[PDB]
Amino acid sequence: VLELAGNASKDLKVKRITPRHLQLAIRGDEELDSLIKATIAGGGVIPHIHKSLIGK
Amino acid sequence: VLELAGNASKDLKVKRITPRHLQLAIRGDEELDSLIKATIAGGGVLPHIHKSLIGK
Amino acid sequence: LTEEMLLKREERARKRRLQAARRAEEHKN
Amino acid sequence: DNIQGITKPAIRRLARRGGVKRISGLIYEETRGVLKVFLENVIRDAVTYTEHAKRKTVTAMDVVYALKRQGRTLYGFGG
Amino acid sequence: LRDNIQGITKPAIRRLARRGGVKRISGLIYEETRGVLKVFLENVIRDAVTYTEHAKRKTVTAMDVVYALKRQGRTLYGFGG
Amino acid sequence: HRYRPGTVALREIRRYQKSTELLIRKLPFQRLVREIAQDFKTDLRFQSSAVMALQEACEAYLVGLFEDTNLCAIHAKRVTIMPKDIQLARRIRGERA
Amino acid sequence: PGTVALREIRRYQKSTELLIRKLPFQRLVREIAQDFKTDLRFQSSAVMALQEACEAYLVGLFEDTNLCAIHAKRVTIMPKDIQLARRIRGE
DNA sequence: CAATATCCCGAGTACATGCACAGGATGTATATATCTGACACGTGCCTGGAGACTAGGGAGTAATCCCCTTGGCGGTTAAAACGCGGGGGACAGCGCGTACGTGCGTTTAAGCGGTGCTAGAGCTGTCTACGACCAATTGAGCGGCCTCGGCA
DNA sequence: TGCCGAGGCCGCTCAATTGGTCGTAGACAGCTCTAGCACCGCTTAAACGCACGTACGCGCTGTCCCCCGCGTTTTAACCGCCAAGGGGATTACTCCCTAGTCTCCAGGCACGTGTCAGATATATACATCCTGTGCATGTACTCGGGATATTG
């Protein structure tokens, strides 16, 4: 909590929920190392798409 | 140990030097699972050339 | 300065010529 | 057999979240192999922690402890 | 100390490679592999010095580095513990 | 009107990579964990929330395996995934061989 | 042709010696520790226990790296293979 | 330019959440406690330094074609989209286990004295294993003898 | 016709593996340690395991009800291929530098002991904090209609 400033408030929604923490704890990278050992239930994943799959 | 002296015999020596551990501990199918974490110091490596790198 | 590499190379010369003497005399028999 | 109910489109959804565009028709019957072995390896441990405590229903904590043992922790159901 | 990672000389990297079962090594593998080894040394000797500092020793000892390895999933048999 | 092959695959990525919902049907996965269990202890019972913690862990494993698999296909000049890719990813992570 | 490089494999997979020169590796480990604390002393067995673990990591990485070069239909290993073997491994 | 789609905004929507409440179990609070180990003191070792030297290796170069790399190849399906099937989804109850409480009594920890197991001792005292060298074998390539097919 | 030209079978010589024999050097197995301090045996007063209805919580159960599955085929380019070119990875050599050995040499410090304190545990009294419960709204949701974006 705290680094959810960068998330909950940015989506204009109140009440922290599990699609956050994910979409943060696996985005900031001093952390991540502390929590690699853990999946977040109901947390999904951050968007990507690799640069060779998108149309050229 | 049963299987290790079982291989010191095959190299025709009397005393089980360190590589004879590696050639069992990382060759028997169940031991390879129990000892995943272990590096045997001075134990060498199990010999193998990849089947695609040999010619003809 | 230069004497180290010089006397090393001199030692290699006598080493070479000792091997020349030996491996020439291997032709005796 | 019950494993064939991990239907082809479900594998495609899982794959789409993972970010893959195009899926060989051999991946369906192969992926079932890795799911079937993964479930096998955590249910052995979950039923072990069950049999230890003499009770005979697998709890959420049992599958949590089984997953914790194998390095695949989940925060959600009770840390 | 000066530049001592250069002392992992090119032939030595080829020896390690040869053990591992590889035929042909592009010339960019040498400067990459020094990069991998320096990152590994940092992440183990840091733990080994923190085990040392706890005991008020100055000399780093074999058990300190073995405990340092043991916590990273890289256990070493041969030096005790 | 009909799109180009490729168009809808990238549309699906942007969908299932934005939701967090469960992707396997409930009952078909609930049947599978019972069948794998009764081979080890006959006449079990499961708590309703135990099987959920199985599902939420499985999906998160499968989705991670594919994410690491696609990295192989991309490296091998393809875009299509094929079994030979999974066998590589799963060998370097030390699971199967 | 192409045979002497393969003759080296059969050599180094039989011997169990350490493959990096000792003094050059010891002076590197003294360098890397100075930025953690000044004026350590190293026990002579500690420096060995590092080397035994390093070589065993490096040679495990080349084993796992070669598998990627085979996947791309190549023979030659390249940095993009090391990068893949480390990314997929989770380093 | 047309079309399917994503984006966006306001109505209307259960319950989730944050709160107030009763009350119980435990965190506090004080006094006592020995003893952990802090600290202080030397003991004696190795970590280190510092030299001389060979020989192993390392670095360098040279020549080069293997292997990679690229283009262009020809061949077949995952994707697209639709039609089309059954199956995952939402309610009624049984009673069996789980919990929990009771009194179940098994064993451990502790402190007791006796004593033999083990782990540091040796030059133990050798002699397996360690080089060192010799000898065998196979295989490959290069000369040399000899029938026959295409040409005068 | 011719000639011969081109043609097809068999002992030298060299170059890895392979297995053999020589001799010698620490390092292994074993002895006696001896020595001592842990294991044991022997009590004790001890904690904590454990075999055992009943309240009853929820795991499992009999129904109907629909999407996503299930099935088809066009196509679409993805992916495979082969062949050529360039160089850059490779090989083999010569010079060179240091890795490694040993040896001497000191004192740094890790080692060890010698005392005994501020530490934290344990009890009793206890008040308080914290849980479980009960209890309004406020939002985050699902839907419908239109605007903007983007594909073909």
Stated as kind and residue range, the H or E segment containing G66 is helix G44-71
Q: Is G67 on the interface with F (CB under 8 A)?
A: yes
| Helices within F1-97 (DSSP H only) | 7-16, 26-37, 50-75, 83-92
Which residues of chain E (47-66) touch nucleic strand I at CB < 7 A?
A: 56-59, 61
**Is residue F46 helix, strand or coil?**
strand
SS3 label, residue C21: helix
Chains B and G touch (3+ CB pairs under 8 A): yes
What is the DSSP code (8-state) at residue E3?
-
Nucleotide closest in space to C8 (CA vs C1'): H54
CATH of E1-79, one of 1.10.20.10, 3.30.1360.70, 3.30.70.890, 3.40.50.720: 1.10.20.10
Give kind and range of the element (H or E) at residue D30: helix D27-52
Contact F32 D30 (CB under 8 A): no
Cβ contact F94:D48 at 8 Å? no
Query: Which CATH number does G9-91 carry?
Result: 1.10.20.10
Give the sign of the dihedral formed by CA F4, CA F5, CA F9, CA F10.
negative
For residue D49, the one-letter residue type is Y
Backbone discontinuities in chain G, residue before each (C to N > 2.5 A): none
**Are A31 and A40 in contact, with CB atoms under 8 Å apart?**
no
Phi, psi of E61 (to 5 degrees): -120, 165
Backbone angles phi, psi at A20, to 5 degrees: -100, -175
CB-based contact B39:G53 (threshold 8 Å): yes
- Residue G55 CA to residue B11 CA, distance in Å, equals 26
> What is the CATH code of the structural domain delimited by F13-96?
1.10.20.10
Resolution in units of Å: 3.4
Q: In Å, how far is E47's CA from the nearest CA of chain G? A: 10
- CA distance linking residue G47 with residue G29, whole number of Å: 8
Length of chain E: 81
What residue type is assigned to position E45 of the chain?
I
d(CA E19, CA G8): 8
Q: Are strands D73-75 and A38-40 parallel, antiparallel or unpaired?
A: parallel
**For residue F33, which amino acid is it?**
V
Nearest alpha carbon to residue B27 among B51, B10, B52: B10
Q: Residue E52: name the closest of B38, B40, G39, G28 by CA.
A: G39
| DSSP 8-state code for residue E67 | H
State whether residue D9 is helix, strand or coil.
helix
The CB-side HSE value for D35 (13 A sphere, CA atoms) comes to 29
- Find tokens 């490096």 and name the residue: G58
Residues 7-46 of F with CB under 7 A from strand H: 7-9, 11, 15, 25-28, 45
Query: C4 CB contacts (<8 Å, ≥6 apart)?
Result: none
Contacts for E63-66: CB closer than 8 Å, 24+ residues apart: E64/G46, E65/G46, E65/G49, E65/G50, E65/G53, E66/G49
Q: Is B49 helix (H, G, I), strand (E, B) or coil?
A: coil
Tell me the C-alpha distance between G17 and F86, whole Å.
35
- β-pairing verdict for A38-40 and F80-81: unpaired
Q: Where are the domains of chain E?
A: 1-79
Q: Give domain D1-77's CATH architecture.
A: Orthogonal Bundle (1.10)
Way it was determined: cryo-EM
Interface test with G, best of B22, B39, B54 (most G CBs within 10 A): B39
The closest CB to that of D6, out of F32, F41, F63, belongs to F32
Window 14-33 of E, Cβ < 8 Å to G: 15-26, 28-29, 32-33
Cβ contacts below 8 Å, chain A against chain D, sum to 27
Contact B28, B35 (CB under 8 A): no
Other CB atoms within a 10 A radius of the CB of residue B5 amount to 14
Two structure tokens written together for F86: 């999974």
